[PDB]
Symmetry: D3
């Protein structure tokens, strides 16, 4: 067989989100980004001439991005935020006693500790593998999946999993 590595990357694989960084002894102000996601994978070229169809990769990256897009990204497991449910809002209180409140529907609660590029990348990697489907990946011989997330064109984090 012949190994090939596929890359899909596009201005469409975007989610335009608000967030703020907080960790021990530090809190940044609320702001936002046009995050962008690329996906790279490795498998053998199949009898149909593809490792896996690009169209499916594009469909599923778009799907995951679309869930995050146009929301405030809210970590679930942060040790430095107090996240309160107040009526139909999340009220967030930082260690410096700064306070924020957002409609719950404007927020996407993600099982991460920090809304950093790195942790968001790991989350997306796990979601992309679920959406494309792990058994389906293995039928295509895919053995490696890698996600790059950029928070702006100049700063990216890349994570992978051997499958």
């Amino acid at each position: 067989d012949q190994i090939a590595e596929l890359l899909v990357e596009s201005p469409l694989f975007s989610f335009n989100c608000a967030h703020f960084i907080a960790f021990k002894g530090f809190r940044c102000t609320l702001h936002g980004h046009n995050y962008n996601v690329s996906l790279r994978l490795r498998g053998n070229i199949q009898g149909d001439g593809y490792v896996i169809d690009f169209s499916i990769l594009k469909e599923k990256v778009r799907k995951v991005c679309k869930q995050l897009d146009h929301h405030f990204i809210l970590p679930m497991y942060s040790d430095v935020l107090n996240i309160q449910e107040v009526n139909d809002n999340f009220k967030i209180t930082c260690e410096d006693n700064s306070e924020y409140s957002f409609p719950k529907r404007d927020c996407v609660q993600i099982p991460i500790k920090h809304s950093s590029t790195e942790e968001i990348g790991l989350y997306i990697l796990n979601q992309l593998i679920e959406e494309i489907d792990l058994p389906f990946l293995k039928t295509r011989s895919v053995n490696y999946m890698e996600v790059t997330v950029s928070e702006s064109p100049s700063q990216k984090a890349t994570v992978h999993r051997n499958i």
Copy 2:
């Protein structure tokens, strides 16, 4: 004399901000963008060989961007937001009764009606002309100033003023 048109554009001329769109009968969710600003100008080439030094354009675009960067962009003159001062926060209430609250220091209050690309462009154009200095522009023979603001690589608004 010889007319020349200068363009300065860069990933540095950025402000990474949160905002949300609201106008009559419409409210989007809180989200964010890596806004980018380019500046174009026209004047005659001076005896020193420049219309105006690129370094000054870069310094001042960076300065204006830096004031907006890492904040929630809050319009001052919106007819569809109720903006309340609560302790050290701005509490914002929309026509659909959605409610937000942010530390005032996380917000940049801008004399616009909507945090649209177009209105933000007009605001930046006016600020850039103040920062570079209008009399200084006229000493360099500059007669045209134009700002492009992008909210993402695929959507830009451009405004100008004849001076």
Copy 3:
């Protein structure tokens, strides 16, 4: 009022097509391109804070592109091609007696003389104005529409209409 100029441009505004150039005393070989379309317009900023919503521009550029995408572009009005209907194919004969045949369904017949970037740009401009809708443009105060078509990143043609 305040004039603003909007630009929408994206790798999505694409149509990946085959074509070949033929004009008097010249015929190139069959080949293809990832054509890309940008749209620029001018109007006044409306009470909602937009000249016109970017989402509608993106929707309609995508629509026009999608009709052309994945087809052979066939001119209707060429003076140097003999275009024959043979069963469910178009058979095309050039002045040098070169012959081609394609399934009609693989072809998009366009009311142009040459599949040049310039003529394709004029065709798209006319189609985009129909799709977005001319009366709707005038309600938004749009007075200028301009299309750029690229046949590769290094060669573009731009056409406009005052409306």
Copy 4:
């Protein structure tokens, strides 16, 4: 010694071709692309200060691209196309009985099964190594050659060989 990895990539390393995808139970329509080729290699920095001269890499990528450019890409080993020689044309018949005919001189017959990005990448990799010359590569200490082919900016396949 010191390992270095060289990358050459450029809008010039292009071939603007028509093709169509066909494999069992599937046929797309005729269309085209601005394919782009990048080359990456690894060797030790030589006493002249280069792993290998960039100019030679650029010359040979251009050469291989130029053979494919402005042609229909025709696979030789497809199990789902019937490729007939008719006078000075290739007549191609698909499993759904769709029929195409092209002048042979407009076609480039390539020893692949599918005109997919992956198979085209393997073909180019093999050709680039022949053109630059394998013994010449080994005199420069090059031990790794890798080709990326893009069919559009958003979809790429990458193949390599250890030499």
Copy 5:
């Protein structure tokens, strides 16, 4: 008739040159740039379907660039440089008594006062019109020629002539 505007722009339209800025009361250090040139023109679409063939524009931009490429750019008409011919070198003395010497063959003497982007743009515009040929432009109905020169991706000057 139909007006169209053509743009050609490419990483190939490059000249990698050394220069330094000097004007009254100012001298920068010797350094260099990958200058890039784009050309924009306006004419009517001709009976062959082109305003003018892109290939000719590309050929001639490459030609002009190639004359400047890999040289020190030496102004002829500077009021602040003393340019001496010493054996087979140019010895250049600045107002601060700084001194440089280069082989004449490493230098390209250009009829400008300052090696600024603006003056280099005017020079290239004049050369491009000579190379493509003014009478030939008028046979194609071209009435406007415009050159953009960038000294780096973030700083460009644009000059034009109505013809």
Copy 6:
């Protein structure tokens, strides 16, 4: 733990320098480039949610670039240049007896043999590790550092060190 790989890359990580290539039996003319530097690193995501803060990477890449920027790059260890100190200049004599002279302050003397992209990359890699600080990198768990240097957008060299 979770491995992540960070990339920082930007038009700001630039140094606009003059240089010329000389090695045995070869000398190019004086010219220049907008060199660009990217940095890639690998470590584990720390309890603060970062492998290492992007801001520190950006600060230090800028610092190293800034030392080289706006100078002639002068190798220290070339076997084919005769480098003489003459008053406040370096006079450089090549094997073909070509002669150059530059103010010492316009030159940056770098401990390399050739001003090639590869050797400049190794030098920058070593400097970046010193500037960010090796012990500080190891506190962040960083185990891999990699620098890419481009002399123009189309030609790059990449070097790394396991730490």
